[PDB]
Subunit: 32 residues, 3 copies
């Protein structure tokens, strides 16, 4: 089902958003 893929993609967009913020916190808190 298409629904199946839509749920996985929704999860991937949320994971990506979170990862982006983590990368920002790390490059700020000297993770350079």
């Amino acid at each position: 089902r298409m629904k199946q893929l839509e749920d996985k993609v929704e999860e991937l967009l949320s994971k990506s958003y979170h990862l982006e913020n983590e990368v920002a916190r790390l490059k700020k808190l000297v993770g350079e």
Copy 2:
């Protein structure tokens, strides 16, 4: 609708490439 998903996936592929490069840099500067 399928087009809708294809576009979201293409954007996720682009964002993932960018993040992998950011992570790679972060890593080199810490090690």
Copy 3:
């Protein structure tokens, strides 16, 4: 096209896991 989307989403999920893991390593090496 459907099989193609499934393949790309599988690649994206694997990439997401690797990035998350690398970021978790970096929280060790930055501290």
